[PDB]
Amino acid sequence: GPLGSIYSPHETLAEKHSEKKLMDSFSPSLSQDKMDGEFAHANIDGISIRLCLNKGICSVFYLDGDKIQSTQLSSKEYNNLLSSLPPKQFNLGKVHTITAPVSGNFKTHKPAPEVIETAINCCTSIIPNDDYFHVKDTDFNSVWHDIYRDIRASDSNSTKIYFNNIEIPLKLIADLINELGINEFIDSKKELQMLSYNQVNKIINSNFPQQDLCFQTEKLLFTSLFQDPAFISALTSAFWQSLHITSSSVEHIYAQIMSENIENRLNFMPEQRVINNCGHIIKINAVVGGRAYEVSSSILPSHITCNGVGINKIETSYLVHAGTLPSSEGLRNAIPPESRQVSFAIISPDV
Amino acid sequence: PEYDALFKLLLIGDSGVGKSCLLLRFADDTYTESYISTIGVDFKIRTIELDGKTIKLQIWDTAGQERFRTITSSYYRGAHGIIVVYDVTDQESFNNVKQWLQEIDRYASENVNKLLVGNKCDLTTKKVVDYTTAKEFADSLGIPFLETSAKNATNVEQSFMTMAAEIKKRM
Ligand SMILES: Nc1nc2c(ncn2[C@@H]2O[C@H](COP(=O)(O)OP(=O)(O)O)[C@@H](O)[C@H]2O)c(=O)[nH]1
Ligand SMILES: [Mg+2]
């Protein structure tokens, strides 16, 4: 070489693709044949980057055909890596803390616009779900009421619902949720009845101009979904207020994070009102009757830190099977605690 | 500490009964339909005057779902009083007052003052839990009982002013 070649895959990716294009290309490594400590990977231009973590030290591996090169990341470099990873669920083996581009204070009722934005898009660390709890009959007992209250106050809620990176208009969900029979007073243990071709059209047409060429595709798509029972199950399940409580492990952590939150809130703002939850960020993708659906429901509960009003993002992911029915019973069984994966992440303001 | 007393109260009950709207009407004296569900714990602080005294009330809020019970428990102990809330338009919420009571025992101190409260009583149309049936069960335990409407501020202040006196009548 003498010491080999001078070419570095990193420099290429850097001048060849955007910064986000790069990050968005990373996915959590679940494969059986993954490097030791590999928690995420990516493939772009015949290169395969691997983000491994060992001894609490993250190193980047670039595999180009056969040559192998790696870089160990400093503490700061790593914290940055996490600060710029896709909003997915990685096995980081520790709940990290991302800092937002804004100086917090202890005289506000809600997290700063920057904190929320940061939260909504940062990745989360998985909490091993092995001692998962068993299905109880009180599971999803409040599902209907929850989605109602959430969507109801969506006008002042950081709540957003997406289907394959396609934002589903809250208005639409507002009428859907209603035409389905969900309102102030509905039976907790009730079973939702699907909608006729007219009902969905009444809905879809009340939000989409028939003389429109623009959102013509979004129109047809939602027309289909709204009729699939499984979909309605996914959309609704995603709001159940206890979706993240799935095992003692999770409980232990969740318990701790809440203590820390409460403590700081007691010492730094005893007379300051703080909203409890910022809302929901649900993302439903059609898995590659009908079809099954993958869900990702994230809650943005306020979380007080040494800097100011922060947010503790708790994300849960599960898989709604093609044959599923919209009912407290159907959901507590099709979506048992063991089929769910919970992950945490804390987003804080700055000094 | 300019206050004379510092009481730690706690609200319990199934999800949607109105625990929060109750606390908000009591602290800020307002009622809205925007603050969504409560995940985890929360708390509000309001100071009143009883018998020319100054009592700093620290009320705690919680999630009604069963799954939250475990972690909620940590907040039971150390509480001077507990207010079990139920939805007078929902039968279920009352049938469970049994459990929310059994829970108070397994965690809080026996010398804790309890007060049952039937909220949403302004919805007379949908009402399904009779004042008498509840007033019954309430007295059979020696627990003071009241019907409240956080929406109209009906007996909301009295519910807390009662708990404040009940406790002050001890220490
Ligand atoms: N009609 C009516 N509804 C109420 C009243 N109080 C609460 N609610 C309803 O209860 C919903 C959820 O109540 P909340 O206090 O948030 O219950 P919690 O989750 O058990 O703390 C509210 O947004 C209201 O629609 C009331 O006095 N009258
Ligand atoms: Mg509440």
Where chain A is discontinuous (C–N > 2.5 Å), the residues before each break are: 288
CATH of A1-73, one of 3.40.1390.30, 3.10.450.460, 3.40.50.300, 1.20.1440.230: 3.10.450.460
Amino acid at A20: K
Give SS3 for A348: strand
Q: B66 and A141 in contact (C-beta within 8 Å)?
A: yes
Whether A138 and B66 lie within 8 Å, measured CB to CB: yes
Residues forming a β-bridge with B45: B58
Residues forming a β-bridge with A347: A98, A311
Experimental technique behind these coordinates? X-ray
DSSP A228: -
Q: Under the phi-then-psi rule, with left for phi > 0, alpha for psi from -120 to 50, and beta for the rest, what region is B15?
A: beta
Q: Please tell me the distance from the alpha carbon of residue B78 to that of residue A171, in angstroms, as a whole number.
A: 45
Give SS3 for A14: helix
Other beta carbons within 10 Å of B92: 15
The beta-carbon contacts of A242-245 under 8 Å, at least 24 apart in sequence, are: A242/A139, A242/B63, A242/B65, A242/B66, A242/B67, A242/B68, A243/A297, A243/A316, A243/A340, A244/A299, A244/A314, A244/A316, A244/A340, A244/A342, A245/A133, A245/B67, A245/B68
Peptide bond into B144 cis (omega under 30): no
Q: What is the 3-state secondary structure (H, E, C) of A135-199?
A: CCCCCCCCHHHHHHHHHHHHHHCCCEEEECCCECCHHHHHHHHHHCCCCCCCCCCCECCCCCHHH
Give SS3 for B26: helix
Q: Under the phi-then-psi rule, with left for phi > 0, alpha for psi from -120 to 50, and beta for the rest, what region is B78?
A: left
Joined together, the tokens standing for residue A60 give: 């980047």
Phi, psi (degrees; rounded to nearest 5) at A186 = -135, 155
Domains (ranges, CATH) in chain B? 1-171 (3.40.50.300)
Residue at token pair 């009583």: B121
Closest of A48, A127, A58, A120 to residue A95, by C-alpha: A127
At how many degrees (to 10) do helices A143-152 and A170-179 cross? 140
Chain B residues bordering chain A (beta-carbon distance below 8 Å): 14-16, 28, 33-45, 61, 63-68, 70-71, 74, 89, 92, 126
DSSP A273: -
Residues forming a β-bridge with A229: none
Residues forming a β-bridge with A141: none
Q: Specify the residue with its C-alpha closest to ligand 1, atom 9.
A: B18
Binding residue positions of B:
15-16, 18-21, 33, 38, 61, 64, 119-120, 122, 150-151
Q: What residues contact A2, with CB distance under 8 A and at least 6 apart?
A: none
CB of residue B90 inside a 6 A radius of ligand 1: no
Q: B80 and B167 in contact (C-beta within 8 Å)?
A: yes
How big is the CA angle at A141 (ends A137 and A144), to the nearest 5 degrees? 155
Binding residue positions of B for GTP:
15-16, 18-21, 33, 38, 64, 119-120, 122, 150-151
Residues near ion ligand 2 (CB < 5 Å) are B 20, 38
How big is the CA angle at A110 (ends A105 and A115), to the nearest 5 degrees? 75
Q: Specify the residue with its C-alpha closest to ligand 1, atom 8.
A: B18
Domain boundaries, given as residue ranges, for chain A: 1-73, 74-351
Query: How far B39 CA lies from chain A's nearest CA (Å)?
Result: 7
Joined together, the tokens standing for residue B44 give: 């509000």
Joined together, the tokens standing for residue A130 give: 């092995």
Beta-strand pair A341-350/A97-103: parallel
Q: Please tell me the distance from the alpha carbon of residue A301 to that of residue B61, in angstroms, as a whole number.
A: 14
Q: Please tell me the distance from the alpha carbon of residue B84 to that of residue B68, in angstroms, as a whole number.
A: 16
Other beta carbons within 10 Å of A247: 19
Amino acid at A5: S
Q: Under the phi-then-psi rule, with left for phi > 0, alpha for psi from -120 to 50, and beta for the rest, what region is A165?
A: left
Q: Please tell me the distance from the alpha carbon of residue B147 to that of residue B72, in angstroms, as a whole number.
A: 25
Rg (CA), chain B: 15
Residues forming a β-bridge with A40: A28, A51
Residues forming a β-bridge with A285: A294
Other beta carbons within 10 Å of B33: 12
DSSP A1: -
Q: Burial code of B56-80, b = ≥16 C-beta within 10 A, e = fewer? A: bbbbbbbbbbbbbbebbeebbeebb
Residue at token pair 């049936």: B133
Closest of A191, A184, A188 to residue A229, by C-alpha: A191
Joined together, the tokens standing for residue A196 give: 């006729």
Closest of B67, B140, B149, B48 to residue A250, by C-alpha: B67
Q: What residues contact A33, with CB distance under 8 A and at least 6 apart?
A: none
Q: Please tell me the distance from the alpha carbon of residue B13 to that of residue B116, in angstroms, as a whole number.
A: 10
Whether A242 and B61 lie within 8 Å, measured CB to CB: no
Other beta carbons within 10 Å of A30: 10
Interface residue of B2, B39, B42, B66 to substitute, partner A, most A CBs within 10 Å:
B39
State in Å: Cα A149 to ligand 2 middle. Answer: 11
Q: B63 and A241 in contact (C-beta within 8 Å)?
A: yes
